[PDB]
Design an enzyme around this catalytic site. Structure first.
Site, mmCIF file in Angstrom:
data_model
loop_
_atom_site.group_PDB
_atom_site.id
_atom_site.type_symbol
_atom_site.label_atom_id
_atom_site.label_comp_id
_atom_site.label_asym_id
_atom_site.label_seq_id
_atom_site.Cartn_x
_atom_site.Cartn_y
_atom_site.Cartn_z
ATOM 1 N N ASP B 413 1.029 -1.629 0.008
ATOM 2 C CA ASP B 413 0.066 -0.175 0.171
ATOM 3 C C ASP B 413 0.469 0.911 -0.424
ATOM 4 O O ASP B 413 1.933 1.426 0.669
ATOM 5 C CB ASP B 413 -0.444 0.042 1.277
ATOM 6 C CG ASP B 413 -1.445 1.655 2.124
ATOM 7 O OD1 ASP B 413 -1.706 1.949 2.620
ATOM 8 O OD2 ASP B 413 -2.026 1.663 0.309
ATOM 9 N N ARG B 648 6.445 16.915 -4.484
ATOM 10 C CA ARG B 648 5.524 17.063 -4.953
ATOM 11 C C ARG B 648 5.780 18.973 -4.739
ATOM 12 O O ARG B 648 6.178 19.265 -3.898
ATOM 13 C CB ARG B 648 3.814 17.195 -3.385
ATOM 14 C CG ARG B 648 4.241 15.965 -3.450
ATOM 15 C CD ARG B 648 4.029 16.040 -1.861
ATOM 16 N NE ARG B 648 2.705 15.313 -1.374
ATOM 17 C CZ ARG B 648 1.238 15.021 -2.132
ATOM 18 N NH1 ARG B 648 1.092 16.079 -2.641
ATOM 19 N NH2 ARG B 648 0.330 14.210 -1.662
HETATM 20 F F1 BEF Z 1 -3.701 2.509 -0.273
HETATM 21 BE BE1 BEF Z 1 -2.916 3.203 0.580
HETATM 22 F F2 BEF Z 1 -2.882 3.506 2.503
HETATM 23 F F3 BEF Z 1 -3.151 4.833 -0.235
HETATM 24 MG MG LIG Z 2 -2.402 3.047 4.075
#
Ligand code: BEF
Ligand SMILES: [Mg+2]
Ligand SMILES: CCCCCCCC/C=C/CCCCCCCC(=O)O[C@@H](COC(=O)CCCCCCCCCCCCCCC)COP(=O)([O-])OCC[N+](C)(C)C
Ligand SMILES: CCCCCCCC/C=C/CCCCCCCC(=O)O[C@@H](COC(=O)CCCCCCCCCCCCCCC)COP(=O)([O-])OCC[N+](C)(C)C
Ligand SMILES: CCCCCCCC/C=C/CCCCCCCC(=O)O[C@@H](COC(=O)CCCCCCCCCCCCCCC)COP(=O)([O-])OCC[N+](C)(C)C
Ligand SMILES: *[C@@H]1O[C@H](CO)[C@@H](O[C@@H]2O[C@H](CO)[C@@H](O[C@H]3O[C@H](CO)[C@@H](O)[C@H](O)[C@@H]3O)[C@H](O)[C@H]2NC(C)=O)[C@H](O)[C@H]1NC(C)=O
Ligand SMILES: *[C@@H]1O[C@H](CO)[C@@H](O[C@@H]2O[C@H](CO)[C@@H](O)[C@H](O)[C@H]2NC(C)=O)[C@H](O)[C@H]1NC(C)=O
Ligand SMILES: *[C@@H]1O[C@H](CO)[C@@H](O[C@@H]2O[C@H](CO)[C@@H](O)[C@H](O)[C@H]2NC(C)=O)[C@H](O)[C@H]1NC(C)=O
Ligand SMILES: *[C@@H]1O[C@H](CO)[C@@H](O)[C@H](O)[C@H]1NC(C)=O
Ligand SMILES: *[C@@H]1O[C@H](CO)[C@@H](O)[C@H](O)[C@H]1NC(C)=O
Lengths: 374, 1178
Positions: B413, B648
């Site tokens: 993630d 960014r």
């Molecule tokens: F899905 Be991840 F926390 F951006």
């Molecule tokens: Mg996350």
């Protein structure tokens, strides 16, 4: 109001050589300069040992005679034993031949026509046998290692108890199942198949010196079994009215057991020898021993009373006379196999040294790593 | 499925089930992360245990024996080992699930505030000021599990949301609310939720008590971006229905956290498994490691060997019982019995009982012991413990440690796992002059690849940066006294900036810098509120953390944003406060990518339009007449540099507006804003009018701070051969920024974007799912030569080598829907990502994260690992071979629903690499070895059958037959499975390529298993036939001449050879010889001798009564002993030496390099991913 009220209202693991998997250790990396000396060490001295074993095994001299065909092949007069029945091994005399002789003396009083009479065997030994001479008997093709046979005895009766019928018949594991009780209802004292089928031939308490009968060689049935066995075998506590002989012991005990004739299985080392069934198809059991005197070169006679049948199942029964070894009888296997092991170790050492001197790589080479090559 | 919820209203007659109880029952608000229910634990656990085939074999044997009884019998103690082992394994599984239960309980007992005094009818204007007020009405403290559909809930600031609720009112008038949705997506922004217009005027328990309504809603549908409902009440002046439509904009979900809001009041709609996060989650599967399934196949091979042995036994026994002239007819009371075939049947099933041991009862208990101890050694690791959270690496699943040794794909993630949720204003380019010093770990890794020794370079550069920073802070203090200046939170490090803000680069640069920082302090949506602890402190409450970072830097440099008047803002410049006047604010939009403010400059005053937005958006709205057109190129160069460093970037442009122009634009905007009928594009056209002209004054660069050691850990896992795909629920641009910082994405790298965009829709095809297909096929044909075809996937499965080519896939969730839809396009997508060293799936739902993991898992049968924090990774993590959750300050569902939970991403390497390698190796060596050792013993029974006519007597005394696997040979193989290390942890992290073996699956096969079975067969032949050949000639094996003929004594010969050979074999296949495992190997051999002695000395062993004295006193025993151990161990040792010498494996070469001191300069516990790392000599 309500809103105002609402507003108003370690684990570090133990550091330790064990838990951190940092125990004191050696990491053995095997390289040729450490492995090849080990191979040669093993080779050299497995060869020492094999040579010494083979040397001490050649000194073992033995006599084997199978007399199972004595009732029919032997005659009333002294006759040479056919060559198939005897094997002599004397190391000072490798070219012996000098066949033994046998003679059958029939006993028409006995009505067991299968085995009766006496087999007299004359054999000449050219060398002396040490002071510890063993007369064993050999059985061939008698199976003492089958599943039901080998569990057929009462340990309660071996241990001297006057075991009940249920103790003897319905015990877990070992029990004397087909042979626990006779048709009358008395418990067989040595119950089970093992005790029933006890080897029966009567062996003499001497070797008759055919040359000079003024000095006969004496044999004993005492000391033919381990002495600690007398801790496991006890004289029975039965009452001669509770027990009967086994079915095949009834020529030995025609009237049955009574006050004086119950066997003492603690003093009966032939019974204790038989009650240890042989693991394999050939069965050798010590029956006579002389621990005092050397058996000097000469001609001896052995008179065996024949009571045990073997020719029904094409079996053999014989005598095996030895002095032995520390490794047992005469068997070249241990020496041959120690020599083979030493030679195989030396051959692998030489083969690996040859493959090393020609295709031997460099040891700590980060260039031979799979990723540095590819 | 539509559910109507009545509040302060009696349920209609049709909704009640005849007894004052509604039909529709709603699930409890409890969360469940356990593998088993209390009432389904035993059936499910025993079924899981009996999905091991040897357990069915043991069960079958006992059952068959007991009903039939037949040969041997003695039931009672036959069923005890299996029952004990199954009970012990069930107890272990219950303790594991109890840890999960404790975490569930902690989550369920969280406190909420629920309205009391109004009966929940559902589960057993609008307000009427006329109705009597009840004082007992209050918001009472309650638990999360106490929440039920239709309860009114009040959520305080920073309180997590307990269920899916509909916002009724918030402490802010107009009913606006902010939620943190980092848990439900990857968003770093706060989301604005709005309360229903009708219920806004309710802000007490008393008003909500006097209220009545009912909501008609759709059912729970697991779409985080959609909700549809309709609230209905009765007007209290006029009796009639009035309806208000409820969007997702009015809903608070269970994963979120209320932020920047004193309180928020709402009505619960979904609870428990009906909430969207739980609808995405799933039900926490029971995971079986890969080696365990392959072990099932190994056990079946062993069944086949046992069947062959029992077949031979039964046939030979029948053939023998048909013979004649046998001693059994004379001495055993033996009779030839009819049906020789059924006697062969009885012999078959006697042999099955004889050769039971071939499948060892101790196998599954041994593997379970080894895996539990491996998990405990992971948990006891101190380098895996996070001191800041006080969190050790906790294994959740105690049987899948060897899966960590075979991982090939890591799905990660992006937000909260890769990144810590911290934004820092790092650099800024003002008038073509760049300011800001920064030294990342990404740049260190790039420069290390470049060759430069970046230990010395990085430490020296960090010292330089800290010195420059202290210089900057002192010069700031000396420049002016700033009330809100706090140096402990400064992140801008530019010495040159403050040293230039006085005089250095000229007065034009002076004014440019001052005005740039002032425009940062003016154009924003940040709110200032006094710190609770320090009254003089301000806390800078903002919806975007980047906006807060910008305003914090503007404050530190001496342009502090204080307070908020009725008009404009009061800015403290160099310690003197002046309030400004804000004419207009055009809000930031996901559609605008730009924010703007208009300020009054006193004279006829002038307007100042300040515009902050993405670099391209602002660059498009710029002046041709005027911009230095040198500042243009310099700023573009700086922003490209910054974006390469992973920051960014924004641009800021001010336009000075004449009074006349602003009057006209103000009035036009006033008409457009008062206008109804989708006023949005009204404001769009008016703001587009004003902003089309602008003068770029500078740009900024904020870093989204990664976790510590993330680029190092990623490069380590790449050297190990593991591919990392980043699946986010966050925007593409943020994922690309993160990729650059991570070092996953570099410059000089192609970005293959799978856009389904209308402008390129004009080019590729007609409409999506033709255009995703077209783009996949085009990239597949262009950058590689292969197309998506079953044979190409077949050929791709074969090679596990890391991809080459410098390509990176970037798919969004819309395109991924189509690319995962059909089987052929799924093939093409998987093939395009199987190459393409970097993969970034951005803006992706939890279902899609799970779908991508499953696509890689099923096609290309391969080991996968998913790591993350939040409820998206719950679905991603459960549908993965190993799921790893990252632990935080508060409880997380990704941590609860995982296999392992680590404090920091950086532990992956150390934990995954070290543990995985050790486990994969430890289990591999252990499992053939087990089958080898047992096999020797058991096969001797079969060899003895050659001599007993296969009748079924035992070679071994019965105590040997239990203590062989229980005591004589268990511990060596168990401690090889628990404590074996091939190289230590330092080398495992220094040479990560040692990991590739597990990816290639070289360590464990069925080919190696069959080779160990063949070695066990050979050694059983030696162990039986060397004692037999010592006996065979005349059966006298003793010096005294006394008999040693009993089969139990031959069995002592056989057993001692088997044990010492087995244990020395296990010791030779150990890499590390520690005092512990060696002590227990020596003890196992001594234990065989000591048991024979102790048991023999007793009269209790009837025929084995003096086996020790008589056998160990025989020189025959020792002669056969030594030569038989030699002949057993020699072929394998010679093979191993020939292998180490001429075809060494990489671990063998690395251990040779270890002995020559290549790794002596590394400290014992050496973390190459650790930022506070001691410099290594070379
Ligand atoms: F899905 Be991840 F926390 F951006
Ligand atoms: Mg996350
Ligand atoms: C004091 C002991 C030494 C200590 C060493 C350290 C020990 C720690 C290491 C453990 C590794 C696992 C070892 C395997 C266990 C089974 C062993 C076995 O061979 O079973 C044999 C029988 O065994 C019995 O009949 C015993 C009778 C009492 C029941 C005891 C339960 C055995 C262990 C239960 C698990 C407890 C584990 C719990 C650990 C958390 C079956 O095999 P067999 O006989 O060849 O086949 C013939 C069947 N027959 C026997 C019916 C004819
Ligand atoms: C009965 C106990 C049930 C619990 C009810 C008791 C309530 C209190 C009792 C608390 C005592 C809890 C101790 C249990 C041991 C593991 C616990 C553990 O910490 O696991 C860790 C993982 O690390 C591992 O994986 C360890 C491997 C499992 C070892 C246990 C196997 C049981 C063998 C069965 C053989 C059968 C023998 C046959 C005869 C019975 C993670 O755990 P944790 O979440 O981080 O929390 C632990 C630390 N804390 C507590 C400080 C937070
Ligand atoms: C032994 C003599 C031979 C006997 C032969 C017998 C057979 C061979 C047996 C061999 C056993 C050898 C394995 C040693 C266990 C690992 C030790 C370790 O690393 O500590 C870890 C244990 O973490 C715990 O919390 C306690 C659990 C320890 C035992 C759990 C597995 C036992 C294996 C048996 C399987 C069970 C049955 C499975 C049924 C399927 C971590 O500890 P910590 O983190 O430092 O503690 C701090 C806690 N704090 C964080 C709160 C501060
Ligand atoms: C020496 O041992 C011999 C073998 O153990 C034993 O032979 C057994 O002798 C009994 C007689 O006591 C025979 O019994 C059966 O004989 C016939 C033929 O079936 C039946 O009519 C009888 O009623 C009885 O069933 C056994 O058959 C026989 N066993 C064998 C294998 O042949 C000798 O009796 C023993 N001799 C001495 C002196 O003890
Ligand atoms: C040695 O053994 C032989 C044979 O057993 C004994 O000779 C027997 O002696 C008895 C009585 O003296 C005679 O009735 C037999 O006829 C003899 N048999 C043979 C074959 O000669 C001899 O007595 C024994 N030696 C000694 C010293 O007692
Ligand atoms: C060897 O000599 C010993 C010692 O005399 C003999 O052992 C005795 O044997 C007699 C039997 O005739 C027993 O009554 C004695 O109790 C034994 N004495 C001891 C001390 O054991 C043994 O028989 C002789 N062996 C031979 C073959 O003659
Ligand atoms: C003696 O045995 C031989 C062969 O062993 C045989 O030829 C001969 O017929 C046998 N003699 C008698 C009398 O049976
Ligand atoms: C006991 O039986 C045996 C059998 O031979 C017999 O000789 C003996 O006389 C019997 N006992 C008595 C006291 O007669």
């Amino acid at each position: 109001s309500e809103f105002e009220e609402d507003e108003v209202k370690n684990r570090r693991p133990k550091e330790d050589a064990f838990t951190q998997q940092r125990l004191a250790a050696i990491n053995p990396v095997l390289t040729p300069r450490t492995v090849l000396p080990l191979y040669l060490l093993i080779a050299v001295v497995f060869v020492i040992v094999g040579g010494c074993i083979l040397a001490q095994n050649s000194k073992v001299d033995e006599v084997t005679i199978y007399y199972q065909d004595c009732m029919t092949n032997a005659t009333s007069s002294w006759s040479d034993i056919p060559s198939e029945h005897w094997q002599f091994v004397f190391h000072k005399y490798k070219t012996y031949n000098t066949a033994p002789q046998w003679r059958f003396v029939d006993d028409e009083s006995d009505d067991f026509t299968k085995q009766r009479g006496t087999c007299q065997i004359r054999f000449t030994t050219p060398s002396d046998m040490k002071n510890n001479v063993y007369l064993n008997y050999v059985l061939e093709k008698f199976a003492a290692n089958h599943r039901r046979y080998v569990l057929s005895f009462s340990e309660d009766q071996i241990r001297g108890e006057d075991a009940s019928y249920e103790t003897v018949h319905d015990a877990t594991g070992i029990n004397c199942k087909p042979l626990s009780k006779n048709a009358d209802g008395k418990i067989y004292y040595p119950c089970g198949l093992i005790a029933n089928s006890m080897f029966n031939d009567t062996f003499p308490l001497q070797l008759t010196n055919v040359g000079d009968t003024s000095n006969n060689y004496s044999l004993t049935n005492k000391g033919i079994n381990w002495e600690s066995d007398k801790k496991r075998y006890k004289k029975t506590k039965y009452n001669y009215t509770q027990i009967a002989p086994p079915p095949y012991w009834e020529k030995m005990y025609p009237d049955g057991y009574n006050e004086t004739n119950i066997p003492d299985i603690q003093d009966w080392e032939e019974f204790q020898n038989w009650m240890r069934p042989g693991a394999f198809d050939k069965i050798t059991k010590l029956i006579r021993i002389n621990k005092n005197d050397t058996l000097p070169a000469g001609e001896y006679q052995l008179d065996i009373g024949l009571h045990w049948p073997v020719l029904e199942f094409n079996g053999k029964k014989g005598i095996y006379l030895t002095h032995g070894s520390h490794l047992g009888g005469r068997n070249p296997f241990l020496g041959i196999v120690y020599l083979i092991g030493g030679c195989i170790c030396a051959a692998m050492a030489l083969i690996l040294l040859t493959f090393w001197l020609f295709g031997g790589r460099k040891i700590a080479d980060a260039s031979s790593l799979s990723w540095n090559m590819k | 499925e539509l559910r109507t919820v009545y509040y302060n209203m009696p349920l209609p007659k049709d909704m009640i089930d005849e007894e004052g109880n509604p039909i529709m029952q709603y699930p409890r608000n409890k969360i469940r992360t356990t593998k088993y229910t209390p009432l389904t634990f035993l059936p499910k656990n025993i079924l899981f245990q009996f999905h091991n085939f040897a357990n069915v074999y043991f069960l079958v044997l006992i059952i068959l024996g007991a009903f039939q009884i037949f040969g041997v019998t003695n039931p009672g103690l036959s069923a005890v080992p299996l029952v004990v082992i199954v009970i012990i394994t069930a107890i272990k599984d219950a303790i594991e699930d109890s840890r999960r239960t404790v975490l569930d309980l902690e989550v369920n007992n969280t406190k909420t505030h629920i309205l009391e005094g109004v009966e929940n009818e559902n589960v057993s204007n609008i307000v009427d000021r006329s109705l009597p007020p009840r004082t007992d009405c209050k918001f009472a403290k309650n638990y999360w599990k106490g929440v039920k559909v239709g309860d009114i809930v009040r959520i305080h600031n920073n309180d997590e949301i307990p269920a899916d609720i509909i916002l009724l009112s918030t402490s802010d008038t107009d009913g606006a609310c902010y939620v943190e949705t980092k848990n439900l997506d990857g968003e770093t922004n706060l989301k604005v939720r709005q309360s229903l217009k009708c219920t806004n005027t309710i802000r007490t328990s008393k008003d909500i008590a006097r209220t009545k309504f009912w909501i008609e809603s759709e059912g729970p549908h697991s779409n985080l971006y959609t909700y549809q409902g309709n609230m209905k009440w009765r007007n209290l002046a006029d009796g009639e229905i009035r309806n208000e439509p409820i969007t997702i904009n009015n809903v608070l979900l269970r994963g979120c956290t209320l932020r920047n809001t004193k309180w928020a009041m709402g009505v619960v709609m979904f609870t428990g498994g009906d909430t969207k996060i739980m609808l995405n989650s799933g039900i926490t599967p029971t995971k079986k490691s890969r080696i365990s399934r392959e072990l099932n196949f190994s056990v079946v091979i062993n069944f086949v060997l046992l069947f062959i042995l029992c077949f031979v036994s039964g046939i030979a026994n029948g053939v023998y019982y048909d013979k004649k002239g046998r001693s059994r007819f004379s001495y055993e009371f033996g009779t030839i019995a009819g049906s020789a075939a059924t006697n062969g049947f009885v012999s078959f099933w006697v042999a099955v009982i004889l050769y039971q041991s071939l499948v060892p009862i101790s196998l599954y208990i041994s593997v379970e012991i080894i895996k539990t101890a491996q998990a405990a050694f992971i948990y006891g690791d101190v380098l895996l413990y996070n001191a800041k959270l006080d969190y050790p690496c906790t294994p959740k699943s105690w049987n899948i440690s060897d899966d960590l040794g075979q991982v090939e794909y890591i799905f990660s993630d992006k937000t909260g796992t890769l990144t810590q949720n911290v934004m820092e204003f790092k650099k800024c380019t003002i008038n073509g002059v760049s300011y800001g010093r920064a030294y990342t770990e990404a740049l260190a890794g790039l420069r290390k690849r470049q060759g430069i020794d970046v230990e010395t370079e990085g430490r020296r550069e960090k010292a330089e940066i800290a010195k420059d920073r202290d210089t900057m802070i002192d010069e700031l203090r000396a420049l002016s006294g700033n009330s809100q200046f706090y140096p402990e939170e400064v992140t801008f490090v530019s010495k040159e900036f403050v040293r230039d803000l006085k005089g250095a680069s000229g007065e034009v640069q002076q004014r440019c810098c001052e005005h740039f920082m002032l425009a940062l302090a003016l154009c924003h949506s940040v709110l200032v509120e006094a710190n609770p602890d320090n009254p003089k402190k301000l806390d800078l409450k903002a919806q975007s953390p980047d906006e807060a970072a910008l305003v914090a830097t503007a404050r530190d440099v001496g342009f502090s944003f204080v307070g908020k008047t009725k008009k404009g803002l009061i800015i403290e410049m160099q310690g003197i406060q002046k309030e400004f006047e804000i004419l207009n604010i055009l809000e930031f939009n996901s559609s605008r990518k730009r924010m703007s403010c208009i300020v009054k400059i006193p004279g006829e005053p002038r307007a100042l339009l300040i515009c902050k937005g993405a670099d391209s958006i602002i660059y498009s709205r710029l002046s041709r007449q005027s911009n230095s057109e040198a500042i243009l190129e310099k700023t573009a160069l700086h922003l490209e540099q910054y974006a390469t460093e992973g920051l960014r970037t924004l641009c800021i442009a001010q336009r000075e507006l004449s009074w006349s122009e602003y009057e006209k634009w103000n009035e036009k905007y006033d008409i457009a804003a008062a206008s109804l009928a989708n006023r949005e594009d009204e404001l769009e056209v008016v703001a587009d009018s004003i902003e089309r002209e602008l003068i770029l004054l500078g740009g900024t660069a904020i870093e989204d701070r990664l976790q510590d050691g993330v680029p190092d850990c990623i490069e380590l896992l790449a050297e190990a051969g593991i591919k990392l795909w980043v699946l986010t629920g966050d925007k593409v641009e943020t994922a690309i920024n993160i990729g650059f910082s991570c070092n996953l994405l570099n410059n000089e790298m192609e970005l293959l974007v799978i856009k389904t965009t209308g402008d390129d829709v004009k080019e590729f095809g007609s409409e999506p799912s033709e255009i995703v297909d077209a783009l996949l096929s085009k990239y597949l044909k262009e950058y590689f030569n292969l197309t998506g075809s079953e044979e190409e996937i077949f050929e791709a499965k074969k090679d596990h080598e890391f991809p080459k080519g410098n390509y990176a896939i970037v798919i969004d969730g819309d395109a991924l829907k189509l690319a995962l839809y059909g089987e052929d396009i799924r093939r093409k997508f998987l093939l395009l990502c199987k190459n393409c060293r970097a993969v970034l799936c951005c803006r992706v739902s939890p279902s899609q994260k799970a779908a991508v993991v499953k696509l890689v898992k099923d096609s290309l049968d391969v080991m996968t690992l998913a790591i993350g924090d939040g409820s998206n990774d719950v679905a991603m993590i459960q549908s993965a071979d190993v799921g790893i959750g990252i632990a935080g300050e508060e409880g997380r569902q990704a941590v609860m629903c995982s296999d392992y939970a680590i404090g920091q991403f950086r532990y992956l390497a150390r934990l995954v690499l070290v543990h995985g390698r050790w486990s994969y190796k430890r289990l591999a060596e252990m499992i053939p070895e087990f089958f080898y050792k047992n096999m020797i013993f058991a096969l001797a029974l079969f060899w003895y059958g050659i001599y007993n006519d296969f009748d079924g007597s035992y070679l071994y005394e019965y105590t040997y037959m239990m203590f062989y696997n229980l005591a004589f040979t268990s511990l060596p193989v168990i401690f090889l499975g628990i404590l074996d290390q091939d190289v230590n942890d330092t080398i495992s992290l220094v040479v990560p390529q040692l990991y590739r073996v597990g990816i290639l699956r070289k360590e464990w096969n069925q080919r190696k298993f069959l080779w160990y079975m063949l070695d066990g067969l050979y050694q059983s032949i030696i162990c039986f036939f060397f004692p037999y050949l010592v006996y065979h000639k005349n059966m006298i094996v003793t010096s005294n001449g006394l008999g040693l003929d009993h089969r139990y004594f031959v069995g002592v010969y056989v057993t001692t050879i088997a044990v010492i050979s087995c244990n020395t074999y296990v010791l030779l296949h150990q890499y590390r010889w520690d005092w512990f495992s060696g002590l227990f190997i020596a003890l196992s051999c001594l234990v065989v001798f000591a048991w024979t002695g102790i048991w023999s000395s007793a009269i209790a062993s009837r025929e084995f009564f003096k086996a020790a004295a008589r056998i160990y006193g025989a020189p025959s025993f020792w002669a056969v002993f030594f030569v038989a151990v030699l002949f057993c161990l020699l072929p394998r040792f010679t093979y191993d030496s020939f292998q180490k010498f001429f075809y060494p494996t990489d671990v063998e070469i690395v251990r040779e390099m270890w002995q020559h001191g290549h790794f002596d300069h590394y400290p014992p516990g050496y973390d190459p991913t650790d930022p506070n790392r001691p410099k290594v000599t070379k």
